[PDB]
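Blackboard transcription, Thursday session:
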Amino acid sequence: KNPKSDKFKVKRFHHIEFWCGDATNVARRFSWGLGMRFSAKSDLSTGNMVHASYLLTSGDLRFLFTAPYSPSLSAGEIKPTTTASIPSFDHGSCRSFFSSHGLGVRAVAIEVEDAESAFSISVANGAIPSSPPIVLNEAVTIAEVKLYGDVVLRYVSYKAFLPGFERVEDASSFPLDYGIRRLDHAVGNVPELGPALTYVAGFTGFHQFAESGLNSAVLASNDEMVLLPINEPVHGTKRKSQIQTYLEHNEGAGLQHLALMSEDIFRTLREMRKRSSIGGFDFMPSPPPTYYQNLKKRVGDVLSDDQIKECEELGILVDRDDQGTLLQIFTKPLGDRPTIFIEIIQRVGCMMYQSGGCGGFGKGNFSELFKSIEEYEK
Amino acid sequence: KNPKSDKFKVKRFHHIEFWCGDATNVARRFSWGLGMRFSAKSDLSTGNMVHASYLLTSGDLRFLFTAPYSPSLSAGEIKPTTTASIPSFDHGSCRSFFSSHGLGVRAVAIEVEDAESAFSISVANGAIPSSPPIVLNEAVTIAEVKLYGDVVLRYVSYKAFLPGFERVEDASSFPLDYGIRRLDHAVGNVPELGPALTYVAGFTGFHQFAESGLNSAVLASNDEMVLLPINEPVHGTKRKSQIQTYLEHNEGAGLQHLALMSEDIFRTLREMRKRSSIGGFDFMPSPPPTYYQNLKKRVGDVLSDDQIKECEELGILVDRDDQGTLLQIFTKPLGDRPTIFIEIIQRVGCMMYQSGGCGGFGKGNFSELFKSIEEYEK
Ligand SMILES: CCC[S@@](=O)c1c(C(F)(F)F)ccc(C(=O)Nc2nnc(C)o2)c1F
Ligand SMILES: CCC[S@@](=O)c1c(C(F)(F)F)ccc(C(=O)Nc2nnc(C)o2)c1F
Ligand SMILES: [Co+2]
Ligand SMILES: [Co+2]
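(Written on the board underneath:)
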């Protein structure tokens, strides 16, 4: 059931912002590793004396990487005279975030009809304010509220990337593309799922979409294209909860993984794996061949034996709903700490356009992986 | 003249350590961009709860990238019980360095005969101590003194990379190589050259090796293989001193550039330029064709017309001593700030092995570049 109780009009995921120590090196690494174009910049060369911000795009997916300059460069500025292109930015908040959490996601940004309204209604409904609505060049409105930990949910609305960003000069912009097209979901880890759900569902109106080490639940907008899973750990097992491991290494709640939809997960994974050891991303260990011997009995009617064999060479996981089928794979952590990672996903089914969440999120793969592991010991 | 006044026995440049916010992403970017292998690691997977350190190598060139974990992971440790593989490391010093300077070089490390002795003699001769001699696994001794700004000169000596580092698993270690072989020199920028020279020459015994915006001087070890240029700005010009621009953006003195010797600067630059826009390094703008039309009259006896044309397609600079000839080129800044950059260099002449500094450091290229610029306006 979908009660469609959004308290404001939400469109789609708009971008994800990483707070970095050096935005240049993270952005260049992510560009090569994921096949994302350099699309826009805001830095010293555009008059920004506050922060260096670089935007990567792939289809509708937008990754923003931001780091602070020396405060001395903008010491004479005040907020009314700021050269920062993102007015919520703050040297102290950014340095504190990164020193506390390491590299990771500061902002999950969704495009809304009216960011000022979305902010007001959110706050009137319990949201903790983080940065008030600010109108940029009479064209774009941006506002922020707290989501969990030091992660903010950012509202952006357009009358018509951001004012103050310049499009990147073609020579600097190499048209890489490995098939990734949009953000499918963004998953938070928190110490207690209950109050996190109540808080976020409280101020958005998002509805519940619906051995492990976790409990979770998914909040979703009216059309279920903005999907916001939240995990909590389950304590006292045999293998320690990776949710609890995250909270310890991350110094508290934060974003656990971004799942990126590919229009062709086989080409994406071929392209990403060729680059794993030459600056790109590493993938988690492949499941045993028992896992793939068991795929015929589960998805033999959705995927041919050749497509199943192709999942096997690439290390791809498969799970299935009552409504659809899902291909997924997981990278190793994106940075030094065992915290944030990326998932590549592709959904087959639920044609009407494709409805969101088609096939679920792979929860069946926990049981399926364990049961392939001990039966591969054989 | 070379008075050979080293106060302790110095062998060679041993490594360069970058202090980072996230060591993983900087190291992976540098690996792809410069063609350096992943060679060794010390992090959580090796029992290091203090810092993440990754070593890249190319020939004798060793780049170390280090970032701090959350202090909470090692809160119960004391220095006698530390899991850090580099005992001089300190969370607070590292966070402070990076937040003040951004990405850059913390340590210029030279291999010496006896790091304890080198430390004692250095300190007895005016060096400001930074980290005392520490013996690692009865095998390697490491010690540090202040060089300029927050950069340390690090002494390492071996009885026989470091204890506690593990060699990197072959699958993770892709044998990239674009021809770079060793560190040729490491250049500091300071506000006042005089006291910096006197200080460093004071405690090492290093001798002076011998429009711009700078004044400089080069300190060198007995065999002139450790070359340590230092710049100061020249104030009140027309173009503002790039040395002064460095000090402002770097928040004070620091390392300006590392010059990396290539055994084949043409292949290196071909390989580096193919990767500039796909995660690698950008190069400064090429000199005008007038610069290359003037190369025949200057180096026509060292380089053929085809080799000169090859310098022209790649953007390579050429200068010449009385003793030798030098090919050089400069990258754009390595990170967000207009501070540290890299130089690729290759020397022809001075055969005895090649003597250090053969051909100089390209000081003639300042005059030659200006004079090609206005004559290219033509
Ligand atoms: C160690 C890294 C892999 S992991 O822990 C993992 C597995 C498996 F690998 F266990 F199969 C299967 C599915 C997911 C996932 O994306 N869940 C998820 N997303 N959104 C919701 C809601 O729920 C996942 F994170
Ligand atoms: C804007 C970046 C290029 S720059 O300022 C530059 C040029 C030129 F580009 F002006 F020719 C020529 C030579 C050098 C150099 O390496 N000097 C240098 N090394 N060691 C010593 C001593 O002295 C240099 F840094
Ligand atoms: Co997921
Ligand atoms: Co140089």
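Lecturer's comment: The CA atoms of residues 26 and 358 of chain A lie 32 Å apart.
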